[PDB]
Structure 1
Amino acid sequence: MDVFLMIRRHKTTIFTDAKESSTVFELKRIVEGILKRPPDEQRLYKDDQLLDDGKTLGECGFTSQTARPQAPATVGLAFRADDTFEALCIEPFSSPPELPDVMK
């Protein structure tokens, strides 16, 4: 089935979809189309965990049950330039205010 993703670096979030059968490499070829950085300059994470180019999205844990259009899964992105590796850093979204009295 289809999986729905948020690719996140710093204060940028990319909305994209893919297949469970798609590879991490194929996913990076997607990000390249958008950010113009080749796959070999990209590092993708699920949480703290680096993803192998050869593995499929389903193999990494990205299922259709957990990567839904209305609640997409997050993929960490950090760049690399030869022997220099950028730290993975994803800035949190803002918080909602306290729930108003008339909803309590």
Structure 2
Amino acid sequence: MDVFLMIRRHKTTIFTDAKESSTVFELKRIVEGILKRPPDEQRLYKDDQLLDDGKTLGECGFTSQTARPQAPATVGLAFRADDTFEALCIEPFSSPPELPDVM
């Protein structure tokens, strides 16, 4: 099965897909291609829970039910600088205007 993800850090958001049987470390490889940072300098999170390199994205709660094309699951990403990982930080998206009374 394919799972559909947003990988998010700061004001960066990657849309990609992966197999449910894929590993957290293999996802870090995907990230490595886009953002050019080695996996040993990367942490991935589900909500606020740090995920382990050997676990499959399924065991981390990303499935067909929860990680759909039109509603992808979010994977938090945090980078290491100077052998110290920054905290997980994900900037929210802009806020919609108040609904027009007409609606």
Q: What TM-score range do you get, normalising by the shorter chain?
A: over 0.9
Where structure 2 has 5 or more consecutive residues not aligned to the other structure, the ranges are none
Unmatched segments (≥5 aa) in structure 1: none
Q: What SS does the corresponding residue of 1:67 show, helix, strand or coil? A: coil
Following TM superposition, the consecutive aligned residue runs of length 4 or more in structure 1 with deviations greater than 6 angstroms are none
* Structure 1 length-normalised TM: 0.95
For normalisation by structure 2, the TM-score amounts to 0.96
The size of the alignment, in residue pairs, is 103
More helix by share: 1
Aligned residues: CA RMSD: 0.9
Shift of 1:93: 0.4
Deviations along 1:2-58, one digit per CA (max 9) or x if unpaired, are: 100001110110101001100000000000000000111100000110000000000
Q: Distance in 2 between matches of 1:2 and 1:41?
A: 26
Cα distance in 2 between the residues matched to 1:82 and 1:59? 31
Offset, 1:79: 0.8
- Deviations along 1:40-98, whole A, 9 cap, x unmatched? 11000001100000000000000111100101000000012463111111000011111
**What is the SS of the residue equivalent to 2:71?**
coil
